Amino acid sequence: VTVDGIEFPPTITPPGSSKSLTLLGAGVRGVEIETIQIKMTAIGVYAEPEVIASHLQKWKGKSASELVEDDGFFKDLVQAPVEKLVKITIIKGFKGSQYGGALEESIRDRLAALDKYSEAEEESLEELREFFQTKSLPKGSVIFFHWPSPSTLQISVSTDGSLPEEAEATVENANVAAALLDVFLGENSVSPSTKASVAEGISALLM
Numbered sequence: 001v002t003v004d005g006i007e008f009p010p011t012i013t014p015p016g017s018s019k020s021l022t023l024l025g026a027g028v029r030g031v032e033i034e035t036i037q038i039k040m041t042a043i044g045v046y047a048e049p050e051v052i053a054s055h056l057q058k059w060k061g062k063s064a065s066e067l068v069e070d071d072g073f074f075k076d077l078v079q080a081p082v083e084k085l086v087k088i089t090i091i092k093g094f095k096g097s098q099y100g101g102a103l104e105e106s107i108r109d110r111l112a113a114l115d116k117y118s119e120a121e122e123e124s125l126e127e128l129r130e131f132f133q134t135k136s137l138p139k140g141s142v143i144f145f146h147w148p149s150p151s152t153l154q155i156s157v158s159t160d161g162s163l164p165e166e167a168e169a170t171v172e173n174a175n176v177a178a179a180l181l182d183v184f185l186g187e188n189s190v191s192p193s194t195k196a197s198v199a200e201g202i203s204a205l206l207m
Contacts (some may be wrong), residue, residue, distance in 0.1 A: 003028060003042040006089045012046050014085050014146040015156045016166040021046035021085050024205075025197030028091075029190050042089040043184060043194045048082040053205055055080040060206045067199035074185050074195060077202070078178070081150060086184055088143040089161065100132025103183070106190060110179040113188075124173035128180075131155065131169045145180065153177035 001008045001023060008026045013019065026044040030037045059073055067073045094102075107125055111117040135157050137143070142161045146154040151174035154167035171177050182188070189195055 001026060003044075003089075004039050004091060006042045006091070008042075008044040008087070012085060012087065012163075014083075014148075014154070014167070015144055015164040016154070017083075017146065017148070019048065019083055021083060022049035023201065024052075025194060025199070025201040027191045027193030027195070027197045030193070038092070040090075040092050040094075042091060043191050044087040044089075045184065045194060045198050046085040046087065047077075047080075048084075049205070052077070052080050052082045053202075055082065056202060056206060059202065062203060062206075064196065064200040064203045067203055068196055071187050073199070074187070077198070078181055078185050079150065083149070084147045084181070086143075086145040086181075088145070090137050090139055090141040090143075093139050093141075094137040096132045096135035096137060099135075099137050100129040103132065103180070104129045106183040107176060107179045110182050110186065110188065111175060114175075114179075116175045116179075121173055121175050121179075124171060124176045128155075128169075128171055128176065147177060147181060150174075150181075151177055153180060 003026050008023055010023050011020045024045045024047055028039045029041040030039055056076060104125055111121050140161050142158045144156045153171040155169045156164040156167045158164050183190055
């Protein structure tokens, strides 16, 4: 599986962890320049395989397009109590401040939508922003967002694209952790293409 020349392996064991996760799908974060689509990042979604399929039986038989059209499907995916991983490969370079700043806005927007941007979430999110501000994210850099459970989140970064031995940072706040997963798989996702690919992967896995 490749996205803009970037290979996504069929399985990944997250940094510092023991359980192997399987590729559900991959897409891109695109932006527009005068209607021209520009790829900024490649995004791959991984989860416990036979396991998550056991939380998605109601979707068996549905085509990828049928799943794309049901927000309840992605809600099920987001809420499923299994390990998940998002692997990001940077295509166009970001300063750490830029990537963290963009990510902060998407998360703040989601938390506001839920009326959950209180002091605890604001402080947790600021720690996540500051984490990225200390990083540089040139082309080829990778980010691993690992949710061992829906309420927890571990982050690691690698400039050269290699798999870190261990996770570097943790988001302890459950609402911030959930909101970040929504950046990728929520209704207001930064990557409809990733969602479409995940729907295709899950449709195939179920049948």
